[PDB]
Amino acid sequence: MEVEVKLRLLTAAAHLRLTTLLTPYHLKTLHQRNTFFDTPKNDLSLRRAVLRLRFLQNSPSPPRCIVSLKAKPTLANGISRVEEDEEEIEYWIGKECVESPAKLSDIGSRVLKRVKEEYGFNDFLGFVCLGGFENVRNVYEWRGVKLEVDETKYDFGNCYEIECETEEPERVKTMIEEFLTEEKIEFSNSDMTKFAVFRSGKLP
C-alpha cells in the first residue's frame, strides 16, 4: 500500500513561502497532467477505484506516461493509505487514449488487465475520459524525507499541498507540522484526493 502524509497549504502565499524556504533542498520540478477514465455509469468510482493516465515531464528529458489503478483509499488525520499499482506505457499510446478511450483496449498493459479482470470488463469500448488537470510538483530532500509540494491547477482555481510517502507517517507528519508551524505557514490536513476535488468541481 501507498502511505503518505498529506497536508493542504491554505493559500498561494503559503505555497510561495514554503517553496522559497525549501530552495536549498530542491531536487527537481515535475509537470504532470493527470487524466482519468471510467464508464459513464461511474463503475470504477462507485467501487472507490480510480484509473489514471499520468503524463509527466522534467535533455534528455522524454515525456512519460504512467497508468495507475488506485483502490480502497482512506484519508484521515492528514494520513492517506491506498492500494496502488502503476505501470509505464508508451507516451504516444497514452496520448491517443485521452482522445479515444476505447484505445485502452489496444494496450498490452498489466494494470489494464487488472482493471478488466477485477472490475468485470472484457474491453474498454464503453469507457470515457473523465478529463483531467495539471499539477506542478516540486520535490525536496529535506531532513531525511522526500517532500512533494504540489500546485494543482483546476479550471475552478488552484490548490496547494504537501505530500510525503513514508513508512513512519506519524513521526514525519509531526516533523513537518512543527516546521510549518515555526515558519508560520498556513496549513491543514488534506481531506480529499486531487481526483475527488477535481470531480467536485469546486475548491475545498
UniProtKB/Swiss-Prot annotation:
Domain CYTH intervals: 1-202
Any matching Pfam family: CYTH
Name the UniProt record assigns to this protein: Triphosphate tunnel metalloenzyme 3
Temperature dependence of activity: Optimum temperature is 45.50 degrees Celsius.
Cofactor remark from the record: PPPase is active in the presence of Mg(2+) ions, while no activity is observed in the presence of manganese ions. ATPase occurs in the presence of Mg(2+) ions as well as Mn(2+) and Co(2+) ions.
Keyword match Nucleus: yes
Effect annotated for changing E2A: Loss of 98.9% of the ATPase activity and 97.3% of the tripolyphosphatase activity
